[PDB]
């Protein structure tokens, strides 16, 4: 809610969840170095037990948007999240149609 | 936290010890993944099962378990009536 930019900065297929996942990528880019420090103090068994419990409590209060496990690739053309290919940012189907028409460079029908 | 070498999962809870003899309302929590530490053995919890808050009275035998292990989320499946 508070992470959604007041002015849309997306140029692809916009969607309720596409706009939601884009806000989690920006929130994580700003807080990743901070989240990496908390995860380093928790796994450092040389620090006092109190220092590890403080970092362990603050990592729980972080907003869900700050977690990297919340990020999930989506289709820039259709906005789906099921059956995505990392190499094209599209679903398996949108990749098929664009590959046949020649809009995806280098891809061709395979026969052997 | 499964691995023992990095302590148990602790969550910010208002676990304030009661004044001698004072009446304390049970602690309402949705953190079903909070390990039952020894420091609140004897307090009254109200764990969220998704829809309702099922009361719980921590004892010395529950230490180590999670708060969600005592609040059933689904209802027993019964064929017929």
């Amino acid at each position: 809610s508070m992470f959604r930019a007041k002015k849309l900065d997306l140029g692809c297929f916009t969607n309720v969840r596409v706009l939601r996942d884009h806000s989690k990528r920006k929130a994580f880019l700003e807080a990743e170095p901070e989240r990496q420090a908390l995860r380093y103090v928790i796994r450092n068994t040389t620090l006092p037990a109190r220092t590890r419990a403080v970092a362990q409590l603050q990592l729980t209060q972080m907003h869900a948007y700050t977690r990297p496990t919340q990020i999930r690739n989506r289709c820039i053309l259709g906005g789906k999240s099921r059956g995505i290919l990392r190499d094209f940012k599209m679903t398996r189907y949108n990749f098929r149609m664009n590959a046949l028409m020649g809009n995806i460079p280098g891809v061709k029908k395979a026969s052997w | 936290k499964r691995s023992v070498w990095k302590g148990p999962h602790i969550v910010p809870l208002p676990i304030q010890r009661p004044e001698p003899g004072k009446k304390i309302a049970p602690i309402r929590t949705q953190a079903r993944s909070a390990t039952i530490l020894p420091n609140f053995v004897g307090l009254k919890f109200q764990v969220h099962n998704g829809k309702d808050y099922i009361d719980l009275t921590v004892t010395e035998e529950m230490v180590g378990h999670k708060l969600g292990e005592f609040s059933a989320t689904r209802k027993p499946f019964i064929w017929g009536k």
């Binding site: 109190r50 409590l57 603050q58 | 809870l13 949705q30 420091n39």
Partner: peptide, 19 residues
């Protein structure tokens, strides 16, 4: 020596919006 105060110390009322 005790870490119990940390749990209640960080326990900010209204943590979960609403109840």
């Amino acid at each position: 020596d005790s870490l119990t105060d940390l749990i209640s110390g960080y326990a900010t009322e209204n943590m979960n919006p609403g109840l």
